[PDB]
Design a protein around this ligand. Structure first.
Ligand SMILES: [Cl-]
Ligand SMILES: [Mg+2]
Ligand SMILES: [Mg+2]
Lengths: 242, 242
């Protein structure tokens, strides 16, 4: 009894693009050989559907959106957790209020709008604020490297709220992510864990700091670092070669 | 030499919907009679295109998006102003930093994310923050009526920044808008002002507090309060009846 899990963007696709019929057909052959297929991404269902196509649920045995907090199996939602339901309203307004003070008190040069973004399964926090232009993204991306503004706020928030059992991952250029210790991709394992001898995980951001790293290094997982989806298929075809 | 200007959502359409070929054909006949057609909405070009169709620029003589800050004439962008270019970076970070403090210091019960949204031509500010559910919108919409949380912050921001020559309009349920005194729909008049004896304005939010109100009551405008786009056509057809 085996299952194959894939990150989405860059693993089953090019970097930011739709899937190939070469990929689909490689997956179909996987399934046809007796594997079950699952998918896991920090992305919300809408974006995953957008990259795998409308028939995503009919194509994979499991679909873990936002790293598993929204979960489908056999085309059937069977789990839904939220940031709000985990923490609760108080702890949430507390974290937010303090983010807003911290940020309001920075001596950085460019600040715009959308500094604290509350999302189903994570806080996204930006000192410059994500209502900023691409250019301003880069000016600031360079500032941060010199001053570690994201690093500091994280230290500050960590030590304001040790009881919150929260984890901090640095997002892209202007933003960092906060979520309860555990809500990386390994969240989803709790669900397939008990049903498969072997679990293959495919992903591309499996270096430390990456979002595949946790699940990849997990010992219940048989990890597979890939570069592009081209690799992914080779691995599949060899898996089925035998 | 005449021009007909229309608000978009609710004036040329139903409330939140596409335009009718009954509307289009009424507009076409207007144009064919020698009128010029213009369009003005706080909405950004994308949303206006989405409601009038892809051939929007080819259909109206002028298209004033975000109340004129982005402007097309004869299918040709001829004006682009921004909040940033008006105020300048300093004055902007100052306003924002203070919004964030104020908000962080509220004793309201539900706060989420996206409290201060920096947009091309206006600040949108939300105490609860617009990352909130519809239900939470209503809980809070009712709170505000009792406590006037939006009213207070506005007083506070007004008196922090009198020199900023800013105007404050209450948005929907959870949000209020801030922008330089003048950037309501009458912004656009500066452009047609000098080319038309008569300027008809059609709109539906022409009561005080509304976004049609300024332009409607303007004396360079021949105002027309309508209910639905059905009215709009009657007015047109009678205009062309003669
Ligand atoms: Cl914000
Ligand atoms: Mg990946
Ligand atoms: Mg209107």
């Amino acid at each position: 009894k085996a299952i194959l899990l894939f990150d989405v963007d860059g693993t089953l696709t090019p970097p930011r693009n739709p899937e190939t019929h070469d990929m689909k057909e490689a997956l179909l052959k996987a399934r046809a050989a007796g594997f079950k297929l699952g998918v896991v991404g920090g992305s919300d269902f809408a974006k995953q559907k957008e990259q795998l196509g409308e028939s995503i649920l009919e194509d994979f045995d499991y679909v873990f959106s936002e790293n598993g907090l929204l979960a489908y199996k056999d085309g059937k939602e069977f789990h839904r957790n939220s940031l709000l339901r985990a923490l609760g309203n108080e702890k949430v307004v507390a974290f937010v209020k303090k983010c807003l003070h911290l940020i309001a008190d920075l001596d950085i040069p460019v600040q715009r709008g959308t500094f604290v973004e509350f999302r189903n399964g994570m806080f996204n926090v930006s000192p410059i604020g994500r209502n900023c232009s691409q250019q301003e993204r880069d000016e600031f991306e360079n500032l941060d490297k010199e001053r570690h503004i994201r690093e500091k706020l994280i230290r500050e928030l960590k030590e304001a709220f040790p009881d919150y059992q929260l984890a901090y991952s640095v997002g892209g250029q202007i933003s960092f992510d906060v979520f309860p210790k555990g809500w990386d991709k390994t969240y989803c394992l709790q669900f397939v864990e008990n049903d498969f001898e072997t679990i293959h995980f495919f992903g591309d951001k499996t270096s430390e700091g990456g979002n595949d790293y946790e699940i990849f290094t997990d010992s219940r997982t048989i990890g597979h670092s890939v570069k592009t989806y081209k690799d992914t298929i080779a691995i599949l075809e060899a898996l089925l070669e035998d």
